[model samples]
Target: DVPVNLYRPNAPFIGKVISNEPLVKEGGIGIVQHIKFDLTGGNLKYIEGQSIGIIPPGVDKNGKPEKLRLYSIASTRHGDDVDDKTISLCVRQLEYKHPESGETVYGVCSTYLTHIEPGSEVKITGPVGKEMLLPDDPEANVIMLATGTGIAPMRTYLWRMFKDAERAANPEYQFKGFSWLVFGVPTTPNILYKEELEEIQQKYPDNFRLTYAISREQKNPQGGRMYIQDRVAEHADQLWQLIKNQKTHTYICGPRGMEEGIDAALSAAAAKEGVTWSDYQKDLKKAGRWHVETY
Candidate 1:
């Protein structure tokens, strides 16, 4: 029954940076950091799947305060240290070429986070967003689809469901049902949370399933770079059956373009059974069985 917006932008919490380590592996393509902040001496509690707004300590081109940027919380409510005193974020430094200027520009907030050092301070706001909250049912089946940094909330759910520390922290929410994650990345090393993810997968073979779509290394049936949608297509029949279950909850988060491809795959699968995917999806949305948070 905990409500959101305990902290607002106008009055934010000043959290100390506990750690800011590179999350990407040696051959990884981009700079992504697994950043954690110490939240002790403050009351910034948040549930899994909620987002926090970070205000960079700098002014803008117009000589105004820099705007706050929201990022999905990667750690569970108990935090990475399991001490209820920290919060973590999986952030990628956003860099792209400017169209008109033909120069490279980095995301202000993201770069600030990626380069931030230990002992530094950050202004954080909001335990916001209810759309991506995890379900309460311990026995409910969860299917998660993600790409790149979209793994944030899904990681939270997975940790809550399977991580030993998380399991120990929550006595009532012992997981007893199936969980699956299909993650898309560019290379083997780019699979964020690789060690911890596989630790759960290897530990709970029946309760958890992990699949990867490594675009640079894997090939689809059409010989193109394999993608998350292609993996869904390959296993559409099984996914259709799982989605039909009343206890099943499906989550999709990633690039917005992923929305179209995944829908097409599932739509074709549902069509084979005389079910219109759009209508079924509508019903699921109405019932809160389907959740999407694409960017």
Candidate 2:
């Protein structure tokens, strides 16, 4: 079934928090949470890779009901409990030093989400987005590149790909093809969903490949901090070869800065085969083979 936008700007559903827990360890760089909301009796259903809007309880600079902020759903369509009655989000509290006052400022919605207690009521909106949805092909080759909370969608994808419960739930979809994830995080502790991701790799060694670019703890061959682009560059030829296969779909999600670097690396690799990277990327987009969601 298609996801429903049960709530909107004027009308929204009040969802109760089922649980809110920290995803990062004690030494993690920033606060990130895996928050779940109970939707047991609601009409708000969502598929993997979709996002829902959260209306934090507060006023804006002008003092009105707070506007909604969208966050990607971190759990599969059946939700974390595999009951189809909950929705979860991987949220990072946005903390930054103000440019003018030099005072620390936290994101309104993000902070609210992270600090929310279980049983608290939350206003939620659309289970929106179709761009990042997984393809119907069970044997499709999926390549995922993510940084920080961008791992949200990738996590959902992997659960559907390799999770025993998910596979049992979706009898029509049994994945037999390859899936690769190149994830970038600042430090080991900052690797959100670390245990679950690694567990999948260990269990499905033949179908999944996991790579990490730990900026603070690792270095690229050029003696620089290992970023996602560096890892992509190291495997550009192999990635290009896979990209040439029509069954391969590449998804890039994370900070906007990463787009340029990733494109450049792929561009160089495609050039070696006498193909223009931009043109080929456009063709992929047209063919619904390339998906990107960055912010």
Candidate 3:
């Protein structure tokens, strides 16, 4: 079962930052942070794919306190240390130039988190959202498609399924089925959790498959920028066959546009078999086999 509102906005728990490391390396296009918080002194445990609400410490223009923002959790239920005492987030500091004034306006909560100093206690609430949670069956297949900070939940799923410490922590849940991740990023350095992801792919070559679409560095079949949808279309046949499997659970967590692209590709794939993708996807959703959290 999923955990609901264990903590609320009115009574948020204080979680101290353990570390706020940058996921993006030098020369990466944007600032992405892998921030972990100490979940000590609270009962804030959560399942994978859940999000925690963070209330930025300042007021808005109207003098009201800043509202809480829900960020997808980046660590597994066992937490990053496998000690059940920490939680993490993959956040991209939202910064953009104003078209009207040319002043750089930063996203309040995300920027607050990016430059947030270690040892500082931040307001946290909830282990909310069950739509993106992983399937409980150990042998069930998982197909993940993600881009940018959307990798947050996929990281949790991968770690819980493949990480050594995480594996050891859940002895009864040894995974044997296939797990494929089609990740899209702007550049090679923009790939979040690069080392961790590469190590798992190398270690479990047969059980896990990793694919990347570096938009700036790779090209699609049409000689255009390689995006996540392009990769999906390229592997549509195999992916379609995998989706037909009773054990398969497909997950989509990325930009909303990518969602449409994937749906369109899968629609064509389903058309080859004389099946309407919309009806098939509806059935999958009803069965909790098709999970989506795109924005």
Candidate 4:
């Protein structure tokens, strides 16, 4: 059973996609859903790593977005108010054949988004994702893990870190620790915000590092396809040492499978070091050393 705090009251962000840009590709599918909003109704304040609940304009008899699905927010709070800035969602177009009819089905959001022309008003209601808000503790080192659209929160976390680094440096700022993002993808194209992330890392080399695990890439031996858990496991000792430090936080958000695997590994790691696995898990959870959002 999931805990209650793990979920939150859902509100809808109503807007139109004023702009759309495709970021990555697969078998005739785009990997990123970069949606810009034209919010004139009100202001919205979204912390990095938080998500929005998009209510699609149209729904079928089943009362579902016949053309869309909910997506996590991908923009930083750089735009005017909540309505003034453009936000994006990293989503993949679903393409699968029906078993009975053998007919192809396309993802609702992808199809609706792909057809919108310039200035076309694509209605959306969201800005509601689970409250995966990271603390403003500048002294709190943050480690984030994500895959596929899961990278949405990690992007926001890094943005906040980069945007608030100045405040973090100030003695008054609560945020002072480093941030690391370990992301997994099928290929280079699906790697979200490659350039932006690189720019941030360039500026804060000491505080930011981006680890990539392109699980499907074969051209580069050093860059062989691997999962994010494998990436983290490869540096298990280093990660353990970091966790042992003070005010450090680890966030796991992606596939439910990955979440379980990482939890088990970390538990085992602690046990190997002579700590009780259950006790360590409880302690980490209590100290905010661990935060997970996997489904």
Candidate 5:
């Protein structure tokens, strides 16, 4: 099903920034901003795994008006305030070193957004996308794997599943099945929404499980960085068992590089049970049991 696109590119909604706080901790490596916008003027609405677009001010390299960049929504459909008047995004400022020139480069839209102050007016459009949506089944097992800012959709899902206000708002959706999140970051400080994530895990010990792979501060058994795939490998047996369940759905979001590692780990585990991982994954996709959004 398509999400509501009340605000389109031609005539976007002008939203005011309610807050633009730093998501990273004191010693965190990169700049990630948690921005909230006041959507009181429009009837814009979105689901858990949808994405919205932001049109930054200024011209591009070709001297044309900057285009919109799509960002995964980090708040639930009811939003952070639970008043349906706000929407939030987890944004990472795009900074990198030029390979040949060795000069620093910054993303136009990301930088423009990161430095934006509260009360700033911004153009917003679209609540598009349907791939990462939550299933209607309240008892279905949800296995989420995310890295860095990819936690956006997972955060939305977790809030809908565990937040008290959300539960109050969504009377029909009381999650009874197990939900597990395996998140990866370079360091502990880089874990976004750390407090909220752990609080849910603590409150719903039986229903929610949270795992982190702090690469810089942790190591794998082979003495390499403890990546998300490493954590998946460590629990591959259990994961494979869960995968065999018809009611279980797996979602993966992160850099594309992690795909190979994750598949390899599952492949090894599935082989032990005489099941081909690739074929099984194909079947899962065909059955709408597997969801992936990697970039």
Candidate 6:
């Protein structure tokens, strides 16, 4: 049976907020919001790694979505392909605190979603985004690098890939692709679905590797802050090897600056290999191995 959330026509361009649980609360900053929705009868189809644009409009003087913000859907279509499974969105809530007024501007969707009770209705449109897709080549490898809520699409793709691997009837149709998810969160409390990622690691130990750069957990030797790029630097050699050979793809998401940081690290690696970093980057684009999504 088609999941209710996958039915695009029931409300055509309309969706209902089904689940809105605060999944991650940090040093006064929430990195992730666990949200689920029920869709209309219209069909919304997308690949595991494809992103969906949620059209959130503008708001009032207070800066609410008078309409709603168009956000990428980070969940996999598999979740809503069958049964009662639903679409999940891992949203990062923006907080604005006024020093003088002392009034904080909470995000519109963030506030609305968090306050939504079961059965609340919300208008939504399109599963519109497709930049990220699993490589069709069986020998290809995917290196997923994400920070905080950026890991949402990675998680969805990982599960969907495994599901595809498990359902192959022909022995030759078995998946030989490898997947690596390098993720980060501020603290242990902020790790979204930590146990599930652990379980996937255990189950697909041969084909999957999950490493995290807990920025808060790692202390600076000089007493400064650390981030995922630090962790990536540590594993530069192995990552470099993957990029140099094989039909490998690198996906970096989350904060805006990390993409350049990753590029810098890769450039250093390429230089050590006696290759120009520009060519290294150019080749990835030509060969379709590098992708970045920052917002």
| Candidate 6 Cα misplacement greater than 4 A, ranges | 1-12, 25-31, 55-58, 62-67, 80-85, 99-102, 163-174, 220-223
User: On residues 81-112, what C-alpha lDDT tens digit does candidate 4 reach at each position?
Assistant: 23335665665555677874559876665666
Residues 30-67 of candidate 5 have per-residue lDDT tens digits of 99999999999788888998889999999987999999
Instruction: Report the lDDT tens digits of candidate 2 across residue range 31-113.
Output: 99999999966788888888899998878879987889999999998999888889899999998977945699989999999
Question: Which candidate, 4 or 6, has the higher TM-score?
Answer: 6
For candidate 5, the 10 contiguous residues with the lowest summed lDDT are 97-106
- Residue 64 of model 6, lDDT score: 46
All candidates' TM-scores? 0.98, 0.98, 0.98, 0.79, 0.97, 0.83
Give the Cα error of residue 63 in candidate 1, in Å. 2.3
TM-score of 6: 0.83
Shift of residue 166 alpha carbon in model 4, Å: 8.6
lDDT of 3 by residue, 140-245 (tens): 9999999998899999999999999988999888999999999999999999999999999999999999999999999999999999999999998889999999
Full-model lDDT for every candidate:
0.92, 0.91, 0.92, 0.65, 0.92, 0.67
Candidate 4 Cα outliers beyond 4 Å, as residue runs: 1-13, 25-30, 61-69, 80-84, 163-175, 218-225
How much does each candidate deviate from the true structure in C-alpha RMSD? Answer: 1.0, 1.1, 1.0, 5.0, 1.2, 4.4
Looking at model 3, residue 168 earns an lDDT score of 91
> Considering lDDT, which of the candidate structures 5 and 6 is the better prediction for this target?
5
Clashing pairs in 5: none
Which one wins by TM-score: 1 or 6? 1
- True lDDT of residue 214, candidate 2: 96
* Per-structure clash totals for the candidates: 0, 0, 0, 20, 0, 21
